Amino acid sequence: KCPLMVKVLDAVRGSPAINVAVHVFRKAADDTWEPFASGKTSESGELHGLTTEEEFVEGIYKVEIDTKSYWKALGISPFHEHAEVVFTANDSGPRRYTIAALLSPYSYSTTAVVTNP
Amino acid sequence: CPLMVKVLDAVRGSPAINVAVHVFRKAADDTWEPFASGKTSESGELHGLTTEEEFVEGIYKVEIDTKSYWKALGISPFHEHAEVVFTANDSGPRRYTIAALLSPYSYSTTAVVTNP
Amino acid sequence: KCPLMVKVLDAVRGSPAINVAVHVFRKAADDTWEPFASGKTSESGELHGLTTEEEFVEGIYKVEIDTKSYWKALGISPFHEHAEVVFTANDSGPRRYTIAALLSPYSYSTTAVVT
Amino acid sequence: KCPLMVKVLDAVRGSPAINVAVHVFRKAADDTWEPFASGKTSESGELHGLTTEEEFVEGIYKVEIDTKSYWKALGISPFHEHAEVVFTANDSGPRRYTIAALLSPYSYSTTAVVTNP
What we know:
Four copies of one chain form a homotetramer. By secondary structure, chain A is mostly beta strands. In chain A, about 5% of the residues lie in helices and about 50% in strands. In chain A, strands 1, 2, 5, 8 and 9 form a five-stranded mixed β-sheet that branches. The first copy, chain A, has a four-stranded antiparallel β-sheet with strand order 4-3-6-7. The interface between A and D is medium-sized, with 21 and 21 residues. The PDB classes it as transport protein.
């Protein structure tokens, strides 16, 4: 599918995160983040087709996950406003990037698995 | 303080209070011989479970009663307990501390070793 | 889809762990673990077909991951001898259990997804 | 004691992360991050005396951890550029905030524990 993938899981429910707001930002020469892409996590807990391979380029991107929206809907008070993931992309070749995050009311753990297709 | 166990709660965002801690030791018969047991304090860390002279090289298993603690808080957990097995003092005496961040249906364990 | 699946990731390299020994046990009335199944992690790092729904029944199952063997092969000495995931299966009814274990030399994180 | 404390640990070595850059920001009226305080992680891996009780305010704050700089000294190529923790401070009243971060080359986990004085 798309080179960029996002998966989110909630510890409290033990079920994949559904209806999650994720925003992708792209670096600019003015040191400002531009709204590269936005999407909503599916009921399966993953987001596919976020960015086309050709559109995806060599840049520093920022990925933000809206922690409050999921926790406010569930009714649990969240400590973090959002989870922010920033990294460089395509240092050498058009390698695919998968972003995985684990959510909790007062903590979160994120990991990225990198594959070369 | 040869061995320390620090336990933290994710949902409450506060250190876990009175989590059952069980420490075992390996035997020649491939059976665990109970070493020590305790309950966590208010700060969440239980200390003094072992003494350096008594603390000896071997394969030790540390059990944390996650089910007993979290069920008391009133929601059903997934893991029956957490087992942290590890050889102790492979090369000389060292200070071992175990950190376990608890959550329903998921947990993470991290250990910090200190040579002196 | 297999009733039980195990996904193992190596945060150190950032790529899924390959050739990881995964052992499954069963609780007995004598408080003794009986080997249920064993396998080796594939290239994708996920194990499928390790158990069948017919054999898979309610009980207390322990999943072992040979972290010490894997990290020794890569040349890194790990703190934990292995990872044990003890849980109760089908307490209420038939459910699909997925085990996710993120590995590290001196730490690990276990996460379960229920379908 | 200290209203804001930060503890950082490395999963690769199982030791406190020494000489790690920590940066604290505060929200302004124009939605611009204004630097508040910054320090280097000590040998024990914890920061003490970063915010004063009077100076610490009820605004929004951000804590940034320079994971990439730490890995460069070790010599391991990291995935993430840095780790950022964004949270509302003093929603109700004075509080003691402790931020704990576990670092890995391609993943990290952050947890927050609060003490009521």
